[PDB]
Amino acid sequence: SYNYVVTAQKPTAVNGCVTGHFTSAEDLNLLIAKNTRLEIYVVTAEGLRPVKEVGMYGKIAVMELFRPKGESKDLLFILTAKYNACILEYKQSGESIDIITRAHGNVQDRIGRPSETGIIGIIDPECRMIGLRLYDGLFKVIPLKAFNIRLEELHVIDVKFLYGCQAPTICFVYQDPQGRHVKTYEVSLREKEFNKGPWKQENVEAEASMVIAVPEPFGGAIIIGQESITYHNGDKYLAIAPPIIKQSTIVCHNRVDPNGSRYLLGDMEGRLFMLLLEKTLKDLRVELLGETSIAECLTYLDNGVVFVGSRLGDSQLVKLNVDSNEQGSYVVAMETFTNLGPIVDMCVVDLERQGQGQLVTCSGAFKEGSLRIIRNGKLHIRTVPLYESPRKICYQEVSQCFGVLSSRIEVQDTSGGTTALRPSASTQALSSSVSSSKLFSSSTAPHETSFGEEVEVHNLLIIDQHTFEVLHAHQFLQNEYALSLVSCKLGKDPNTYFIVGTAMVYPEEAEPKQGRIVVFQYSDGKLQTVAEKEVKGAVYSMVEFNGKLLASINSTVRLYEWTTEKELRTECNHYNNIMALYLKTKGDFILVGDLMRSVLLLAYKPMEGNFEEIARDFNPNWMSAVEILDDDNFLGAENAFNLFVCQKDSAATTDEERQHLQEVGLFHLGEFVNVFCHGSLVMPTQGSVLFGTVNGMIGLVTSLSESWYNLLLDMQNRLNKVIKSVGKIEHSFWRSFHTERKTEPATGFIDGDLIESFLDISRPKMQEVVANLQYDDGSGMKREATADDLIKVVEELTRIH
Amino acid sequence: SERPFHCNQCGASFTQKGNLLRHIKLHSGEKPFKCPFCSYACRRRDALTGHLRTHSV
Amino acid sequence: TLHDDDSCQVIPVLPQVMMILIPGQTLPLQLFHPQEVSMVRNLIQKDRTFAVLAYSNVQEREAQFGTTAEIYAYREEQDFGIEIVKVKAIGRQRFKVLELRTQSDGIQQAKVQILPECVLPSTMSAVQLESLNKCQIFPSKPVSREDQCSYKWWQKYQKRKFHCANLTSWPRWLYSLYDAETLMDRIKKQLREWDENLKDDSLPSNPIDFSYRVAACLPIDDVLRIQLLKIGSAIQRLRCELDIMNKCTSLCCKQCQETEITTKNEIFSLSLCGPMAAYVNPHGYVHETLTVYKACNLNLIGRPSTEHSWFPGYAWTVAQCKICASHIGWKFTATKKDMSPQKFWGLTRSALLPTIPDTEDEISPDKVILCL
Ligand SMILES: O=C1CC[C@H](N2Cc3cc(C4CCN(Cc5ccccc5)CC4)ccc3C2=O)C(=O)N1
Ligand SMILES: [Zn+2]
Ligand SMILES: [Zn+2]
Ligand SMILES: [Zn+2]
């Protein structure tokens, strides 16, 4: 296999945000974290001045600014997910802008158990040292050589640097087998060992989750849980328990004023709160500000403006008015930034019938759930909010409408029924219906329902492809989870139908004993229920298989035919020793895979009306999505933000092993893939597979010849010498296949981003690289490489996205 | 009647030697539907019947 | 001491060690050959490790994998004039057959490649939001018998740890079928039906050793035990064990396969040792014997005897299959009246399989036998 992967759309999810004086001690900068991308914005009176966007050879996990001893401006600390660290300084050289790596290094240790609470990176206020918590019972310290110190507390929740102490001192919240408590520890570099912390509180709330150290005028640390918000400063102890917080746990924050009198707090659901200090300190007081997108990170800007960093929905710029608004909120949204992530499904449509192809995604979650329309002609973005969770999508041209699996949250009232949290598309439908089935009404059992908590109800929405208006909503049964969706014609019937696979989920029954496949037809603004077919398991996936419907039921793969009675006739069956979750087809071949990378490849034999096992390969690892490249090669995604391709085993001199699959492709993408689909966004490369991520990243993968692969390999190795590498991180190390304990160099995949960067280097760099390369234009004439030949080849390669 | 012929596998007590040997042979197996006339063992009990009927005649 | 992964190693092979070993399972062994001692009399200085094999068709000697064993006890004498030599061995790293050298006398050496133990992190490490890493840890577990008997507590658990699973194509309760803690609980709910020993301390928290402790208590086939060893993923190993404990319940004669002996409901743990354990007879034959309350379709052989009884206070009587007369085990009958079960049965596993009940319902005949 010889493949090429390139970024088509940079990530849109916001995983971090900080403000500081980076471009100059007087300038005010805004820093945005977008997975592999880092953005620098300057705070203006009207808004934010965009300055620079860069790409890193690492997944940004920690990002904090600091002002070093006797230095011009704030310096930046960054740690990658692969544990590469780098320190950056903003450099202007006339018209050229550069980010220099003042120091770099990797802080990995071969042996270490990563803590449950993840990576944490903090810097002391004096900017003397950097604290890192990567593995339990160890604490790395950098004053880029580093040293570890032992920790008897093996379950750290959160830790921060104290203000106003004789030496840098840390205070943390741990959970021991006797409760949850807070503690302190002092640092001695000269000793490279721990000293005694100034104080200690032997008990704290069982759900303590956030620790914030208040600056020097106050000192101490703020502790926040579900029920209690406490303050501790040696022997000073304060505590409050406001009601407005029990609905959602406090998750993200930011310091408002440098004197430390006001804090911002956001919940898991988009409510934004402010912490006010009534000053010694007398008491604490909390106030609701309003509702925002679910916030991953928050930053107080200035002029009553706060930046909303969101992973689930669009980022927002909001104003903080001294008076509340008529709905009760003090916040109003000023400007929104497009966010494509998370992407749970997508489809490609040539809406204008121009041979183009437009990308339409089911994106977001909860009230930020939305459809995203992507148009190339660079990429154009239209946003259509849905206010509930989208799941799956398919396109039906004859009806000029989309089918979308949707789910909304409701809470149990006290009136017997349930109430929605907010208006959504499923309650704004022009027409509505709820299916009724005696077959599943035949389920009679105990079902003690508590009355005051959440529950999921799934719905099917039908929406016009032009206006994107809610045409029709069909509600699914109680305890029924909408899983699979497909639109296609069957048998001799020329009508086009929507087929939906469902399952019944009950809280005390793990393995699903029940499920449905329901066929729908959309006519004159109404969805007519066609048929009902009960199966004894969950209907995970369905795929059009040449006039027939291939369906997955738990670990069973069943092929259904279309009867003349407009029903499904079970033709044949194939039982697998794994749960048949992922299902992709091409022609008569059938590839089946589970969640744990267990691959299973079948081929339907029409002469006997059944399936034959062609090959099989098990390699235990979490798998997120899988796709077929061609008859002999298949692409998958497996944890570790990693991609893999396995071969159909060409010419194995082993009859019993021609059914075994090798491993010819491995690649570290840096993104978590959820769905693959064939298509291209335009009118030497073969094939085309687009994929969407949780961070909204979009790339294109196509196949190459051995000559094309071999040529680009030496070019990449050459470019790695000349391209200025962020943090001096090697591309071979970045793209290395990496599990939490293993590492192996990638092969079979060309990093199209790095290839395209060739056009943006100075012309002297190009000639330097091309020199001493043996060139083959194809079939005829092997010579030395021409500086030009690559460029015009490179452009025709760029003309894929 | 004191059964001094014990089987090392299961422990069965037998009153005569030759009865114990008949026991330890059944411990082994090899499709244990042995026909006593010919010794042809069969994999199932119904195929023994169809095989047994060829044995009387 | 343990060998590094994938290493090309040469290990002795012990003849007449006919079983399939699962790592950590202890093995007492009766020796009689001087060659068995001749291997041990040197092995004990000092490796103390050989290679238990996994024969599929031992009469044709078909084996493909196995489990290294670490001889951890060895001390013996010639008391009452009979020279007696017994050792306790324990299994360690799984392996795969490559080449084999039957040396001069027996001395079958094993050219072997170590099998790597494949550890996998949680399902959330990729998609879990950095903001909620503080929320990952729960306010611990109540370790009780009331909110575990109730499921409301665990629902909130399943709700929280996979809250960010809403960013995938798959909902939470699916990952519950891959959550080690959930799968352990599903087993932490089945063996209290079987055993009264405290799960809490006796079981290990780590699923690796916990998977092998489940594997050394299930009366399953020799072949089922085999592909159970092919499974590097402790998670897959648990689901396979689980779906076995769901389907594979009622046990039949391995040889005739026409006689339903007993059901898994009839299993019970007599002592803290467990329901199934390895017992030895006075001739060196090792029996993985299971204890069950009731069994049927068996004939008894001979009179009961207390001689060398593994359960003092009970007299055993040989039991064999009604149809094929192959040995199934023993009927243990109490000697006194103050004995608790009075008639606890007791079957040897190598003749058993808790087979799929081919339900004789004319409306529910066959079904699906996905051996996962
Ligand atoms: O509960 C259980 C199940 C049965 C299992 N046994 C017991 C057992 C005893 C013997 C023979 C050993 C030789 N003596 C000779 C002798 C005669 C009278 C007095 C003393 C010695 C007779 C018994 C052979 C096989 C087995 C066997 O498989 C076990 O150990 N426990
Ligand atoms: Zn016997
Ligand atoms: Zn015969
Ligand atoms: Zn039998």
Side-chain angles (χ1 to χ4, degrees), chain A residues 1-325 327-438 440 445-446 451-801, chain B, chain C residues 1-38 40-45 47-75 77-112 114-144 146-155 157-198 200-359 365 369-372:
Chain A
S1 200
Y2 321 102
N3 301 86
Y4 174 98
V5 61
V6 63
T7 296
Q9 165 58 53
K10 296 178 283 181
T12 65
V14 177
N15 60 279
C17 51
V18 287
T19 58
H21 315 284
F22 184 56
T23 57
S24 91
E26 306 84 36
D27 288 327
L28 186 63
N29 297 126
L30 174 64
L31 277 65
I32 298 178
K34 291 181 175 175
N35 180 34
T36 62
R37 313 304 303 192
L38 172 69
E39 297 175 350
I40 297 169
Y41 286 72
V42 171
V43 176
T44 73
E46 52 278 64
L48 301 172
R49 177 142 64 95
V51 172
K52 197 57 172 186
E53 191 263 7
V54 288
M56 286 195 59
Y57 297 149
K59 287 192 52 59
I60 303 170
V62 179
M63 178 175 67
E64 297 294 338
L65 279 167
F66 68 105
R67 179 68 74 113
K69 225 163 176 293
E71 285 263 0
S72 38
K73 46 196 193 310
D74 290 330
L75 287 192
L76 177 58
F77 166 77
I78 276 183
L79 178 68
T80 70
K82 285 188 175 188
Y83 304 98
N84 312 275
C86 60
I87 295 184
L88 302 179
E89 170 189 329
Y90 189 85
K91 182 64 189 179
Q92 171 153 15
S93 302
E95 290 177 346
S96 79
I97 307 161
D98 299 297
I99 292 85
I100 66 177
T101 302
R102 286 278 299 272
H104 88 292
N106 191 293
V107 301
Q108 194 181 4
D109 286 334
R110 175 181 297 104
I111 305 304
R113 204 187 74 111
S115 300
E116 288 162 291
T117 55
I119 297 177
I120 298 175
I122 48 176
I123 316 173
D124 84 308
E126 284 186 296
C127 301
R128 272 264 309 281
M129 43 175 292
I130 292 172
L132 285 179
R133 202 295 305 274
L134 306 181
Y135 318 101
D136 283 316
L138 299 166
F139 182 76
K140 197 161 299 217
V141 173
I142 301 179
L144 297 191
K145 294 171 278 293
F147 69 107
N148 280 319
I149 311 181
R150 277 289 174 183
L151 284 157
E152 268 54 71
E153 294 75 295
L154 313 171
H155 302 87
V156 183
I157 307 288
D158 191 15
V159 60
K160 297 237 161 55
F161 277 107
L162 276 66
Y163 278 88
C165 291
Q166 330 307 319
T169 301
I170 56 175
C171 165
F172 63 96
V173 164
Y174 69 100
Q175 179 170 313
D176 54 11
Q178 69 174 3
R180 192 172 289 190
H181 328 297
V182 62
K183 195 182 176 181
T184 49
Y185 274 143
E186 294 203 284
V187 183
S188 179
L189 277 175
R190 205 161 180 85
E191 195 179 326
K192 286 184 183 58
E193 274 142 51
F194 272 147
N195 286 341
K196 180 217 68 177
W199 33 271
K200 160 72 173 182
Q201 172 54 261
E202 285 71 25
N203 281 331
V204 82
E205 195 200 320
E207 275 270 50
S209 60
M210 187 169 309
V211 170
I212 308 176
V214 194
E216 205 160 38
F218 302 92
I222 289 288
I223 280 77
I224 297 179
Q226 292 182 343
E227 312 157 337
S228 62
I229 304 178
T230 70
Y231 172 79
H232 298 68
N233 191 343
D235 288 311
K236 189 163 179 55
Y237 160 74
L238 283 158
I240 60 175
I244 41 180
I245 292 184
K246 69 173 186 177
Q247 287 211 83
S248 175
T249 313
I250 308 303
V251 287
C252 55
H253 73 86
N254 176 253
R255 198 210 308 114
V256 177
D257 38 51
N259 55 38
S261 68
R262 297 191 294 172
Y263 286 123
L264 284 174
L265 299 178
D267 72 341
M268 308 171 52
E269 308 169 323
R271 306 195 201 96
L272 182 61
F273 299 84
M274 172 86 65
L275 172 57
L276 297 101
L277 290 193
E278 300 186 345
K279 49 199 69 182
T280 182
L281 173 63
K282 184 163 285 182
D283 207 356
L284 277 55
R285 175 192 159 201
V286 188
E287 182 187 36
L288 168 64
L289 309 181
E291 191 183 81
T292 68
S293 301
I294 298 178
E296 176 72 14
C297 79
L298 300 164
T299 44
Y300 174 79
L301 302 188
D302 197 10
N303 317 315
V305 179
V306 169
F307 178 78
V308 170
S310 185
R311 285 291 313 270
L312 308 184
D314 285 349
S315 289
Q316 294 172 314
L317 288 177
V318 297
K319 176 74 177 190
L320 295 190
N321 305 122
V322 56
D323 294 337
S324 83
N325 92 83
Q327 312 313 102
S329 166
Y330 297 72
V331 317
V332 182
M334 291 183 51
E335 200 180 353
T336 66
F337 302 98
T338 300
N339 174 26
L340 304 181
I343 300 171
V344 304
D345 200 13
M346 70 187 196
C347 67
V348 183
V349 293
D350 182 23
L351 284 172
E352 290 292 309
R353 275 162 174 87
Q354 293 168 358
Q356 167 75 338
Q358 311 188 17
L359 204 51
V360 187
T361 78
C362 292
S363 292
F366 312 129
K367 73 181 197 69
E368 308 299 336
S370 62
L371 299 179
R372 312 287 173 153
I373 303 89
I374 302 143
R375 186 173 185 185
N376 202 18
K378 69 184 192 179
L379 298 183
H380 293 306
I381 312 165
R382 178 169 190 186
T383 294
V384 177
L386 306 167
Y387 309 96
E388 59 178 2
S389 302
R391 306 299 305 164
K392 300 280 176 174
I393 192 169
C394 72
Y395 179 68
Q396 191 170 100
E397 191 194 296
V398 300
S399 308
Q400 297 290 283
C401 72
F402 293 94
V404 167
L405 295 181
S406 297
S407 175
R408 74 168 183 273
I409 306 295
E410 289 208 357
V411 290
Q412 289 272 348
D413 288 317
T414 49
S415 322
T418 50
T419 289
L421 297 171
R422 73 190 70 254
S424 64
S426 63
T427 71
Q428 299 176 293
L430 295 188
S431 46
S432 308
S433 59
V434 180
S435 183
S436 301
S437 161
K438 143 190 62 162
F440 280 50
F451 220 82
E453 62 185 13
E454 315 178 10
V455 70
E456 260 190 37
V457 174
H458 283 233
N459 300 79
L460 169 58
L461 314 181
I462 305 303
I463 282 171
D464 159 62
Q465 80 173 45
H466 312 308
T467 67
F468 299 76
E469 186 179 9
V470 186
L471 297 183
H472 176 92
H474 185 91
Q475 175 183 314
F476 281 96
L477 297 157
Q478 190 196 21
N479 302 104
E480 190 168 38
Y481 194 107
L483 292 167
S484 39
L485 165 70
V486 58
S487 168
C488 64
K489 289 179 226 204
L490 289 179
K492 302 295 167 59
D493 195 332
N495 299 338
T496 315
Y497 299 95
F498 290 107
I499 314 176
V500 176
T502 89
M504 286 304 167
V505 175
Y506 300 109
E508 57 279 359
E509 177 182 293
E511 302 267 0
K513 297 294 203 69
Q514 224 170 343
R516 287 200 304 156
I517 298 178
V518 192
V519 177
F520 295 98
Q521 184 184 29
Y522 177 72
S523 46
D524 47 71
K526 181 66 182 61
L527 208 45
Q528 287 287 76
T529 305
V530 184
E532 182 145 30
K533 172 83 79 169
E534 172 184 18
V535 299
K536 301 168 184 170
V539 186
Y540 286 147
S541 298
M542 295 183 304
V543 171
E544 178 271 339
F545 198 69
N546 306 291
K548 314 174 184 178
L549 174 65
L550 184 62
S552 58
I553 305 161
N554 289 345
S555 295
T556 307
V557 166
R558 190 168 300 168
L559 176 58
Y560 286 88
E561 305 192 286
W562 187 236
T563 74
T564 48
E565 278 56 43
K566 287 181 188 292
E567 284 191 296
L568 293 173
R569 187 171 68 200
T570 303
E571 176 187 337
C572 44
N573 199 92
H574 181 290
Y575 294 107
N576 317 273
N577 47 336
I578 64 169
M579 186 178 300
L581 190 51
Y582 293 98
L583 201 60
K584 308 291 175 80
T585 71
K586 168 175 170 58
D588 285 342
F589 296 97
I590 293 163
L591 195 169
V592 182
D594 78 338
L595 201 66
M596 304 197 65
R597 159 89 188 270
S598 308
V599 186
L600 189 143
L601 179 53
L602 295 180
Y604 167 62
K605 301 208 274 184
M607 305 315 301
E608 305 162 40
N610 201 35
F611 323 101
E612 192 198 337
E613 188 181 304
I614 299 311
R616 169 184 297 191
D617 178 23
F618 291 3
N619 188 343
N621 198 21
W622 301 124
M623 188 171 82
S624 60
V626 69
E627 188 47 86
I628 300 169
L629 282 174
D630 55 13
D631 301 70
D632 306 304
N633 305 276
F634 319 110
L635 166 67
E638 57 172 311
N639 202 10
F641 312 91
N642 273 358
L643 289 208
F644 61 96
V645 172
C646 57
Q647 204 186 58
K648 207 170 190 171
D649 187 2
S650 64
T653 54
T654 42
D655 267 315
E656 289 97 303
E657 288 61 37
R658 295 189 303 189
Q659 76 105 13
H660 176 265
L661 313 172
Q662 266 55 38
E663 200 171 53
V664 298
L666 301 171
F667 184 79
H668 178 59
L669 167 68
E671 287 281 2
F672 185 94
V673 181
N674 273 328
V675 51
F676 297 99
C677 91
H678 286 263
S680 171
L681 299 187
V682 300
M683 296 297 307
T685 67
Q686 45 269 10
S688 187
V689 171
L690 297 168
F691 57 95
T693 70
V694 166
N695 294 330
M697 182 271 178
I698 299 178
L700 190 155
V701 176
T702 185
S703 298
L704 304 171
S705 84
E706 181 176 43
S707 173
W708 286 106
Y709 178 81
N710 280 335
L711 173 61
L712 300 178
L713 174 62
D714 187 55
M715 287 283 303
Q716 287 198 177
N717 294 304
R718 293 161 177 262
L719 274 169
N720 304 331
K721 301 179 184 177
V722 307
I723 299 285
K724 300 293 185 297
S725 171
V726 182
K728 289 181 186 185
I729 296 166
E730 285 301 298
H731 170 264
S732 299
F733 185 94
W734 161 230
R735 298 307 200 183
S736 294
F737 198 106
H738 148 73
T739 76
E740 206 155 274
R741 294 161 185 84
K742 284 89 78 180
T743 290
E744 190 157 10
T747 183
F749 277 82
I750 295 299
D751 187 355
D753 299 6
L754 185 62
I755 296 305
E756 286 189 353
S757 74
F758 166 82
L759 302 177
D760 295 308
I761 70 187
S762 70
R763 171 141 271 261
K765 307 299 182 55
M766 301 189 186
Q767 277 136 1
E768 168 194 338
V769 170
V770 71
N772 328 293
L773 174 52
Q774 298 301 342
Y775 172 81
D776 169 293
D777 42 317
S779 316
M781 280 47 252
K782 171 259 193 179
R783 65 172 132 101
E784 180 51 45
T786 305
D788 313 352
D789 288 347
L790 323 162
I791 307 170
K792 278 158 184 179
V793 160
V794 165
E795 164 155 68
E796 206 176 356
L797 293 168
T798 64
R799 268 172 191 174
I800 65 178
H801 80 131
Chain B
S1 68
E2 74 145 317
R3 315 183 79 96
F5 297 101
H6 315 275
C7 168
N8 322 304
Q9 214 166 105
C10 66
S13 273
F14 293 100
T15 205
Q16 305 169 359
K17 181 215 182 197
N19 291 18
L20 168 59
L21 290 316
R22 183 165 43 248
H23 177 67
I24 76 163
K25 248 49 80 176
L26 267 296
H27 274 341
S28 313
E30 164 37 43
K31 46 190 186 135
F33 298 107
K34 294 179 180 180
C35 168
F37 301 99
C38 56
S39 67
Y40 292 98
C42 293
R43 291 185 187 181
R44 308 188 179 216
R45 139 81 191 283
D46 213 62
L48 172 72
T49 71
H51 169 67
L52 278 183
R53 281 148 193 165
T54 68
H55 264 312
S56 300
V57 189
Chain C
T1 165
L2 281 181
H3 298 262
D4 43 329
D5 299 359
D6 305 51
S7 176
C8 307
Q9 297 298 138
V10 178
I11 322 187
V13 169
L14 277 205
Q16 271 143 23
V17 174
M18 297 322 169
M19 68 164 306
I20 301 93
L21 216 173
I22 303 171
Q25 199 185 5
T26 181
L27 172 58
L29 274 193
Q30 290 224 11
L31 304 184
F32 298 98
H33 268 73
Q35 305 289 12
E36 297 176 310
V37 171
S38 283
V40 172
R41 195 185 289 172
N42 325 297
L43 174 62
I44 217 65
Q45 267 210 131
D47 176 65
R48 303 194 303 271
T49 86
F50 58 103
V52 171
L53 314 181
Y55 307 79
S56 66
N57 188 287
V58 60
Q59 227 282 311
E60 295 280 323
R61 297 269 159 163
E62 297 178 18
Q64 313 83 40
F65 314 100
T67 307
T68 55
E70 194 162 338
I71 296 171
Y72 74 95
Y74 165 68
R75 253 203 150 76
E77 52 277 311
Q78 72 306 300
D79 75 335
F80 52 87
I82 292 193
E83 222 304 316
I84 284 148
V85 165
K86 282 73 222 193
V87 291
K88 308 191 211 168
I90 181 168
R92 282 293 143 90
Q93 317 192 226
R94 315 176 293 102
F95 64 69
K96 171 192 200 252
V97 163
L98 314 181
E99 143 189 70
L100 182 127
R101 285 292 90 161
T102 311
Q103 286 202 263
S104 53
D105 41 356
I107 318 164
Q108 291 104 350
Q109 293 317 99
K111 163 71 66 167
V112 80
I114 316 296
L115 282 186
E117 194 76 38
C118 171
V119 190
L120 286 182
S122 184
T123 49
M124 297 283 96
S125 79
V127 300
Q128 170 60 229
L129 299 181
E130 277 94 331
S131 58
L132 310 188
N133 293 15
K134 53 188 70 69
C135 323
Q136 279 288 137
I137 289 189
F138 293 85
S140 323
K141 70 294 178 173
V143 295
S144 161
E146 278 166 7
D147 221 345
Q148 167 198 357
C149 277
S150 298
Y151 43 61
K152 328 278 192 302
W153 191 101
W154 276 79
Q155 307 172 342
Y157 168 89
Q158 169 274 142
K159 182 176 177 175
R160 186 175 167 193
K161 188 156 190 173
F162 307 101
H163 180 102
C164 318
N166 286 270
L167 312 181
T168 74
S169 304
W170 316 114
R172 307 136 291 100
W173 50 264
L174 178 137
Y175 303 94
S176 307
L177 307 184
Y178 294 79
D179 171 24
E181 291 272 351
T182 294
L183 298 183
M184 292 172 52
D185 163 72
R186 298 175 72 184
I187 296 175
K188 285 171 196 191
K189 290 178 171 175
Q190 299 281 17
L191 314 181
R192 286 113 302 283
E193 313 177 8
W194 299 17
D195 195 348
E196 315 310 297
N197 309 328
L198 252 53
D200 168 52
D201 198 5
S202 57
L203 308 173
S205 65
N206 153 266
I208 290 173
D209 304 347
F210 178 82
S211 90
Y212 291 155
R213 282 301 141 272
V214 176
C217 281
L218 305 189
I220 47 145
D221 321 64
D222 277 18
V223 287
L224 252 67
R225 189 179 266 194
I226 291 175
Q227 85 151 304
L228 194 67
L229 297 196
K230 296 186 170 167
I231 301 183
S233 148
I235 301 280
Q236 291 166 348
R237 204 180 278 129
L238 286 168
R239 283 190 48 73
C240 203
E241 288 156 19
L242 242 192
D243 200 42
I244 280 171
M245 296 178 78
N246 300 13
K247 287 184 163 183
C248 296
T249 62
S250 301
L251 306 95
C252 69
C253 180
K254 186 194 227 151
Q255 226 69 19
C256 76
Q257 305 178 13
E258 318 207 342
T259 282
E260 186 172 327
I261 303 295
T262 183
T263 64
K264 66 102 180 178
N265 305 85
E266 305 296 343
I267 304 168
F268 82 101
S269 192
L270 190 81
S271 179
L272 61 84
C273 60
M276 185 157 67
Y279 303 84
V280 73
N281 79 350
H283 291 292
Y285 281 84
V286 183
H287 290 275
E288 276 222 305
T289 312
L290 176 67
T291 49
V292 302
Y293 283 133
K294 286 170 271 179
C296 43
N297 299 316
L298 293 177
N299 309 319
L300 300 185
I301 305 304
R303 276 176 280 276
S305 179
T306 65
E307 183 185 7
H308 203 278
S309 173
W310 298 322
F311 315 95
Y314 292 86
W316 50 265
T317 321
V318 172
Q320 53 166 241
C321 185
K322 256 196 180 87
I323 277 58
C324 70
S326 295
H327 179 225
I328 298 305
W330 309 262
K331 176 184 182 165
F332 289 82
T333 48
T335 61
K336 303 167 279 183
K337 203 82 188 190
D338 71 282
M339 303 283 81
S340 34
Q342 202 67 22
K343 64 151 301 173
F344 84 90
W345 260 98
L347 318 186
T348 291
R349 159 193 75 78
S350 40
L352 314 170
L353 159 56
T355 181
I356 322 285
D358 315 274
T359 295
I369 318 304
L370 300 322
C371 215
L372 190 59

